[PDB]
Structure 1
Amino acid sequence: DKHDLSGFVGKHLVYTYDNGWNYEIYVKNDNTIDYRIHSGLVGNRWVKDQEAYIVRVGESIYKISWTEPTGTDVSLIVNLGDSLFHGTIFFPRWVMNNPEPTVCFQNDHIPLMNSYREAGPAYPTEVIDEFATITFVRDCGANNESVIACAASELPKNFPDN
């Protein structure tokens, strides 16, 4: 059944892009995620309660897609059976130009982001398209507010320490 997000809702995942960029996702429910970026262009950025379109595309392969307040588009592939992760991120020109002003707990700064989104140049878009190694998987149940509750810099040095 393609409409059964059963095996994916509650998923907490750590994974490293072929470019070295390190990222972490928590699938909060059938339309919501939390995430926390640990390194790369926008390292330390993190985000609770991002509306996402979440679907099943294979027995155990799921897709998540969403749009940011910054103008960024994301579409991710998590293959749980084969342990394969694929991410495409379309960033606006100004994020590439100035990544450091997207770096924050976004929830405190959503009108700031909308501001940058209409000033710095939208275009041309940077497509960053990349495979990642899933470094950790876990299930944490639905609506769990405490999976992603601080910045990555606040975590043990270590993280994971499970």
Structure 2
Amino acid sequence: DKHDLSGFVGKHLVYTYDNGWNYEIYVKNDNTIDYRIHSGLVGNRWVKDQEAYIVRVGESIYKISWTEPTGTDVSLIVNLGDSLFHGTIFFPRWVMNNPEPTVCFQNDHIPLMNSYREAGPAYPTEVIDEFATITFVRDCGANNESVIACAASELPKNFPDN
């Protein structure tokens, strides 16, 4: 059933690019995600309650797409059976030039993200398109506000840690 998201809602995923950076998605409900970035040019950025389009595209393969207050567009694949992540990000030009102004708990700064969005140039768009490896999966249930509740910089240096 392509409309059944039972196997996905509640998922807490750690995925890891080939350079070793860790990323997190928590699938909060059938149209909402939390995420948390650890490393890189937008390291420590995190986000709660992102409205998203979450569909099922294979037996244990899911897709999540959304648009961000910065002007960024995201479309990702979570293939749970093959432990395979794939992400496409459509970054406005301003974000490529100054990725650090998106580094915050975005929920506290949505007007600021919109202000930056309206200003620095939207174009040309940079498409970043990249596989990662799913390195850890948990189930935390739907609507669990305790899954993603701090910046990555507040987590154990040990991370991940079950």
User: What TM-score, normalized by structure 2, do the two folds share?
Assistant: 0.98
Shift of 1:20: 4.5
Shift of 1:17: 2.2
Shift of 1:41: 1.9
Structure 1 alignment gaps of length 5 or more: none
Shift of 1:18: 3.4
**Does structure 2 retain, via aligned residues, the 8 Å contact 1:20–1:40?**
no
Aligned to 1:61: 61
CA separation of 1:9 and 1:62: change in aligned 2, threshold 3 A: same
- Cα distance in 1 for partners of 2:129, 2:92 equals 14
Alignment of 1:1-162 (within 5 A): 1-18=1-18, 20-162=20-162
CA separation of 1:78 and 1:96: change in aligned 2, threshold 3 A: same
- Cα distance in 2 for partners of 1:19, 1:123 equals 28
Shift of 1:146: 0.4
CA separation of 1:18 and 1:130: change in aligned 2, threshold 3 A: farther
Shift of 1:158: 0.6
User: What TM-score, normalized by structure 1, do the two folds share?
Assistant: 0.98
Which range is displaced more, 12-21 or 49-58? 12-21
- Cα distance in 2 for partners of 1:21, 1:77 equals 18
**Does structure 2 retain, via aligned residues, the 8 Å contact 1:18–1:130?**
no
Q: Deviations over 1:117-140 (max 9, x none)?
A: 000000000110000011111010
Identity of aligned residues (%): 100
- Cα distance in 1 for partners of 2:147, 2:64 equals 18
CA separation of 1:130 and 1:32: change in aligned 2, threshold 3 A: same
Secondary structure of the structure 2 residue equivalent to 1:112: helix
Shift of 1:11: 0.3
Q: Aligned pairs, how many?
A: 162
**Does structure 2 retain, via aligned residues, the 8 Å contact 1:42–1:103?**
yes
Secondary structure of the structure 2 residue equivalent to 1:55: strand
Structure 2 alignment gaps of length 5 or more: none
Shift of 1:7: 0.2
